[PDB]
Amino acid sequence: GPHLLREDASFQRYGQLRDNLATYWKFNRKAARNVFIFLVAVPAGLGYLAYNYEGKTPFVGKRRTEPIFEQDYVPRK
Amino acid sequence: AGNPWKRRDAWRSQGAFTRANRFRGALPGFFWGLGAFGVYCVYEK
């Protein structure tokens, strides 16, 4: 109605660019390094913890079967 | 001239800001702490 927001010309170019980054993206050898890390390194990275330890962690009330405290003190002398 | 403001910073070492007045009783009532203690010393006898 009364244009309560004092529109800034250079803000619009900023928002217009930030909403259209995908147009100017090019699949070079650097974008290929970041795609690999984020989609094939990390997902496979957690793809081994999620399977090397799946069904191998019986932690519910895991009792203690080992002494903790030393019984015989041997001085260095 | 050496230290051209000799007539402006003089009060930073005179009067209440002299070396004695600054350190004057920096320990609050040290002798008063002795003073009541001295009463208790001979009261202990």
Binding site: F59, V60, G61, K62 | -
Partner: protein, 64 residues
């Protein structure tokens, strides 16, 4: 609190209360940013406290 979760209810609200108080003068840039820094680093601690509480339920079955 008599269980670890009630402690967590209080534990979080020190951060919410501090975030408001540290950034009390919200017109001062160094103070609005300082509230966010005090809120977020505590949440990093609270992120691990939640994880610890879970292992308490896993191993023992309760947080009392």
């Amino acid at each position: 609190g008599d269980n670890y979760l009630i402690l967590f209810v209080g534990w979080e609200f020190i951060g919410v209360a501090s975030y408001l108080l540290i950034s009390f003068w919200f017109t001062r840039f160094n103070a609005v940013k300082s509230g966010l820094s005090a809120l977020l680093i505590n949440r990093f601690g609270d992120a691990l406290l939640v994880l610890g509480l879970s292992y308490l339920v896993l191993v023992t079955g309760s947080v009392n």
